[PDB]
Each structure stands twice: as C-alpha cells, then as structure tokens.
Nucleic acid binder design. Sequence first.
RNA 1: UUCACAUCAAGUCUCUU
Length: 806
Amino acid sequence: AFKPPPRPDFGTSGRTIKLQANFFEMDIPKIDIYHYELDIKPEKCPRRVNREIVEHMVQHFKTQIFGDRKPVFDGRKNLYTAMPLPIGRDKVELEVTLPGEGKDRIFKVSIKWVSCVSLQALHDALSGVPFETIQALDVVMRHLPSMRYTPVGRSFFTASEGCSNPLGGGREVWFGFHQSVRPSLWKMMLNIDVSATAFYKAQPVIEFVCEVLDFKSIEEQKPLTDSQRVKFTKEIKGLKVEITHCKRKYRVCNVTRRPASHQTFPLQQESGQTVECTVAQYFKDRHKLVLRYPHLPCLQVGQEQKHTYLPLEVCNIVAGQRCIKKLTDNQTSTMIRATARSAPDRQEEISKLMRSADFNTDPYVREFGIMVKDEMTDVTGRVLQPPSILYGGRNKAIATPVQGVWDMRNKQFHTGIEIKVWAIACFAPQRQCTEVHLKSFTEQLRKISRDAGMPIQGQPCFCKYAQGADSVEPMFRHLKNTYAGLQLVVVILPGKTPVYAEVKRVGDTVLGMATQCVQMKNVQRTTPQTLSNLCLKINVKLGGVNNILLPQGRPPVFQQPVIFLGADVTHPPGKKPSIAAVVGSMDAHPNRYCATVRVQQHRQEIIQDLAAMVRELLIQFYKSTRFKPTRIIFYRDGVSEGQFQQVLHHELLAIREACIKLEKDYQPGITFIVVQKRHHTRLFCTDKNERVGKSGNIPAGTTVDTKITHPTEFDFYLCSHAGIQGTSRPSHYHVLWDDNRFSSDELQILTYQLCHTYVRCTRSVSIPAPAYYAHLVAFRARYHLHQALAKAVQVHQDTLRTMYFA
RNA sequence: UUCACAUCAAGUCUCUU
Ligand SMILES: [Mg+2]
C-alpha cells in the first residue's frame, strides 16, 4: 500500500492517429549542478521580495562570490548554479539593504552548500526517479519568467499592453501561460499551454467601490447602507491596498461599520494620556488632510489591533492581484469568450508563445546548457472502438455511438417506468406560465415519453401554483398524504431561486420523493431534444434503466462480480466544510448507483470517513445482487501527483479496512485509479482529416500512453468525449494500485466504456460515470446545505437507494 | 433548474491609526 505498480504493457487496441502534444523535448547536459541553501532574515518575506533581494545580492557581491555566473532562485531557500560557487563548502553571511518606502533597510542573507545535483543520474532514470533533480530544472526554467511576470501557481500572467479586458466589479482579464517540467520516457518534457485568469484592476479604492456597487459617479453622498457595505467588505477583505499620502501594500482584514467621521481609535497624547480620536480628525491634525469622503467607511489593516483604519480615498488597489472569488455568470462567459479559440487555433497560440518566449536564448537556461525544441512532440494515439449501447423496447434497438454521440430516435429505454401518478408544482407566476403553457408542455412531454419507452399515463393528478421556499413542504406533505402511489413531482422554476435548494432538500431528505425541475423558459417553449433529455433524468430517478452496455462487448472483468466506485471531494472558497462523496455500482450493467456523502475538514482532499462510506456501498451491492464484489475498481477524482502517496496511504487502507470489517478473510482485488482533468496537456491532430467538428479536436476514444506519459508507472491519457467547443481536455488516469493485474488495453477499454454509462445524456463523457456521479452528489449536497451538518446531508431512507442526484 | 462540451505561496514593516 506504498508504491504504485509499474506499467504492465502499452496495449494495441484502436486505430492509430497522429497527434502532437504541447510537450517540448529538452536537451539536458550530463554535468553536475550545485545547490545552495539560503537563510534570509527576516524569513517571512513573500517570494517576490526575496527574489529581488537575491537578485541585488548577486549583482552586489559580484567580485567576491558570484562573478559572471548566472544563478537561479527558488524564491524561498534554494539557489542553483551551473558551476561551483567559491563557497568551497563552508557557510557565508551576507548583508543587503534595499530601498525602502522611507526607511531604506535591511536583509541578512547567508549561503550554505547542500549537494551536487546529478543530471546524468536523471538520464539513467529516464531509461528504465530524482524529484530533487526535477525540481532544479523547474527552477532554471522559471527563474526568468518569475522575475518579469506575475507568478500564479505554475503559471505566469501579465497585464495587457494591450487589450485591457474588463469584467466589471474591479475585475479584469490577464492573459498568461503555464510552464512545467515533466518526465517521460527517454526525454524530459517542457509542458507549455496558454492560460487566462481574472485579476483585480489597479485602481483607487474609491473607483473600486463604484464598480462593485455599480455606481456611475461616486456621489449619485450619504453613508453606505448595511446592504451596500457588506458586499463591498466581502469583495475587498483579503486584498492588498497601498498608501498614496506618505510602496507599502497592506493587507485588508475588515471594513469598519462607522464612517471616517465617527470611526475612532485610541490616540496617545504627548502627556502620556490616551484619548479617542476620529480617523477624520487625525488626518486633519497629523496629515493636514481634510477628508473628501468622510461619510465613507475605513479599511482596517494589520491585526485586530493596533487599529489602523485607513480612509478609502488614500488607498489604491495593489496591482497583480488574482481574483479567487468565483465570477458572475457573465464574467465567466466573457472570460471563456477570450480563451476558447479551437484546438487548431490554440495550437498556434502556443507556437506563437514558444516563439516569443525563445527559451534557446534565455540567459539562465543557456547558462545551464539546456536546450528546448520549437516543435510539438509527435505522438501516436489509438482511437478505441466505442461500445454498442443497448436499448430496450420491442425491437431491442442497438445504438452505435458515432463521434462520442448517439441518438434515441426509434429507440426505447431498457426498462422504462410506467408513470401513472404524478404532480406539477409551478413556482413561476401564472402571468408568465399559463395553464395553456403547462398543458401544451405536458402534451408535448407525454408524447416524447411515449416513444421513449417510458409512457406517462394521462394528466397529472395534481397541479398548483406557489411562491417562496416556505410553500414547498406544506405542498409536499400534502402530496405524499393525499396521493397514494405518487411517483414524480414536476417543479417549475422562474430562473434562479433558493426554492430549488428547498425542493431538493425536502424531496431527498424529508419526504423522500423524486422531484424533476424545469425552468420557466423551457415550459413556455419546448423542444423534442430538451424534452427527451428530461425523460432521461426522470426514468433513472424512478429507478429505471435508460440503457446498458452491450453484454457481449465487455471487458473480461465483468465475468465475476465487481463494484465500480467513484469518489470526489468539493471545497468551499467561508469557514464552510469540504464535502466528500463516494458512489458505487449496484448491478452488473453497470447502471444503477448508490450515493454516500460526508462533511469534513475545510480544504481537505483526503476522504476521512472513507472506510465507512465504502462499507455502506458494499452492503448495498449485496442487497441488490446477492454478490460480494471480487474486485473493487476505484476512480478517484481531483488528486495531484504530489498527493499520490498521501491518498494512497489513507484511502487504500480505508477500502481494505472496510473489506475486513465485513468479513475477516474478504480480500477483493482493488484497483485504485486517479482521474485528472485539471492539467495542461493538450493533444492536437496532425492530419486535418482527423479533426472533428470545427472545434477541430481529437475524436472520442483517442488514447495516449506513450511518449509523453510516465517512464515507469501505469498511466495514460484518454479523451473519451467529443469536443464541442474550444480545446478538449484529454482526461489523465494514473494507476496507484492494482491487485487485479489489469493490462493497458483492458483497463483503457473498460475506462472508455464506463464513459458511455452516463444517463443524463446520450453522449460519451470526459470522465467515467462513477467519477461524474460523485461530483453531482457532492454538488447536490451543496444545495442540501457540526453534527447538524452531517444530518443536513443525510438522504431520506427510500431515496437512499436511488440516483436522486441525476 | 434538459444536457454535454468548455471553465498551487507569508506585504507581519518605517512613531504608520
Ligand atoms: Mg475534486
């Protein structure tokens, strides 16, 4: 339970396709490079500051220490050099003083040698693995960009010269790129990809207040209401501000309730005695400054103490601050508008980026003798054959997926459910949604249901109008009590409303009855496709089977009983908890899934109570099939490489712990797979004849497990979905454990077929259904809103065995 | 709420409030 398995083989399935990956080969010298450690005093300075200190330190001590050498820097505590520094071995203490805001002051730095980073040893590892050596290369690579650009994670960003793209609310668009050094067989790869994220516009807080509160002019003043203030506080708390009146960015902690004219602080007079002085008066006495907007609040900085309240008019927003807060429906949209391009389009943008970057002329990488190709790596992919999807009806219509898509026309559900009793709850005003609208909708709806293999028998037994989330349960109690055998409640909503949160709360936790929701606009105007996808959601919500994988066309793993698990944990931005969700198959298709859900520590990827969740799912698997899984396939979503050994140590045992809590000698083979969509590896078609759709992506089924993958471990890429817009993300899979002795072909084909079991659409999705369902559960649980919390997330006993999250 | 695609770094200081 400690070390991931080696790659078993490469696999031969599918027909070859020629691809290029945004990976650029690196030529690394066989030399040894030298590692030094740095003790900077004070040691709590951010990387940007340390970088400047070190940059000045290298220039200043030119003659004695560095000379004509060009050392790179961690930003924290590591410096690397191409040839040995004249440290010799023993520690040296250096002093730097830099320009200050007005104090002009001090930094104590010292160098000590640590080791000799062997690059030749790295070459050997790439031929059948030194993280430390890899970390050194990253530093050599991003030493320069880190100086000129704004480092964000493993990416860089700069302000447009330029476009200057707004988003409103003080937010603006910054275009950037990602750079990372990746290992692969034989070669070291430089992963490059174009990026774009939100940043706060460098403007005075006064102007910032306007964009946040939608002010034309400042005046349009009187003190901000309790409403206007809490929004501004929530938008500025945690941001850096700088003083205009007399370079020192300070970090905002809170915004005062009282205006500057009335907000006070204890000021100590020259006679020892302290007194309460207003911020407005202090700026008059001390700074000769009569406040222009005394009716506006004060930004509060430093700690809870000392106090340090600053008026809004003397503060600006520090440049280079990324926006962490999620953005409005539109801001996201216009951001995507900027990004999206298409796969051919973005491949040029990377090449354009590689052209301007010009690594082969970088002073620091020339120093280290490193060379990088200007052409994308050429890889062969295999496009796997999609599984035949089996439908029911009388004709047993088999659908064959074409380019990640199939249809339901002239086809019917595997086991369609006979809806006989159902109600309708319209929360949209009758003025917008009329009885004619509902009736039309319904008649249109039923007609689809008919040809879908899931017939709705007649008119709804109940139909009413309502308003407010408070009117949900009194109607819902009424429905369950007065209608015996009630199957479905069709709630109709006017756009966005907290009613949905209550509808899903009561329907999944309190009363426990399926509730399908639909916006007002989709009732006023109905389309056969939209209605059809609704029938996909309500059939499975009533314990139905839309379609199953073709039995004969399945991997040899289904020969014995096997459960497929899907796990994902979603996180909040406030002091809210993280939500861990784990699902599991409940049949041999696989089609039906049960959902477990927990709450845990704030920002914690490790599923804490995993052993309990897996235990529950295993019980349900036996309650549905009389079978104890001989194998456990686990698709874990959202785990990075640096956390692999962490989640493997706790979550693999947790699954094993769950197996032996049931029975002492119950040890099914466990396959632990981590799925990733959060990466920067893109695949492009070499031939223009292989491009699909004018987004021009790789076809669904494109599998890459060579050239750019892990040199020793079992990992592969699989773009299981059909790209509709922009550039597709080839989902990465990394086998952390596998008792089942899977082959490359079998596991990749299995993973690919599992992407065809997603019931919400007649498409092949990016991640397997278990992983996707797990996301839906942890997202539905977020609409479900300590121990109260655990209770809030608990699903009603009868909806406990249904795909309510569908 | 039809659906899919698309969508990880310390500003703690300088008589400073
Ligand atoms: Mg996640």
